[PDB]
Amino acid sequence: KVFGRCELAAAMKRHGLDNYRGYSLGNWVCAAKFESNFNTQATNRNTDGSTDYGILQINSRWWCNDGRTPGSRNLCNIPCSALLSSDITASVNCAKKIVSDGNGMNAWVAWRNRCKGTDVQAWIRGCRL
Ligand SMILES: [Au+]
Ligand SMILES: [Cl-]
Ligand SMILES: [Cl-]
Ligand SMILES: [Cl-]
Ligand code: NA
After folding, report:
1. How close is the Cα of 93 to the center of ligand 2, in Å?
2. 101: annotated binding-site residue?
3. Which of 78, 99, 112, 115 gives 20 to 30 Å between its CA and that of 24?
4. Which are the contacts of 90, defined by CB distance < 8 A and separation ≥ 6?
5. Which domain holds residue 80?
6. Which ligand is nearest to the CA of 17?
7. In 3-state terms, the chain is what percent helix, strand and coil (to 5)?
8. How far does residue 90's CA lie from ligand 1's centre (Å)?
9. How many domains does the chain contain in total?
10. Are 94 and 65 in contact (CB under 8 A)?
11. CATH of residue 12
């Protein structure tokens, strides 16, 4: 599913992401924009053999199991495929654990390079929330 900008913002809020670990909703919509262009089915292989999955490109190196990333962990205790669902509950639940890991949203490199410090509120502009 390719979410609309305000549609994803609404779903992220409902699942409690707005202001989770102090990050406003626009930060999360911006991270999703640059990580997956709002597509829940996005997958991208990393050079180390791991793979990033879903609207927030969660890496199999640490967070989910895909059966093909040797020596990795599955900290969100889920198959990576669950992160490609039309329903973003699993991605949100795992993102909450990632962002609590110590480095905040810097775990998402597109967030650091393309969202951090910008006017992230623009991402939820005009949305009925
Ligand atoms: Au949802
Ligand atoms: Cl594996
Ligand atoms: Cl949803
Ligand atoms: Cl932080
Ligand atoms: Na893994």
Report:
1. 20
2. yes
3. 78
4. 76, 78, 82, 83
5. 1-129
6. 1
7. 40, 10, 50
8. 9
9. 1
10. no
11. 1.10.530.10
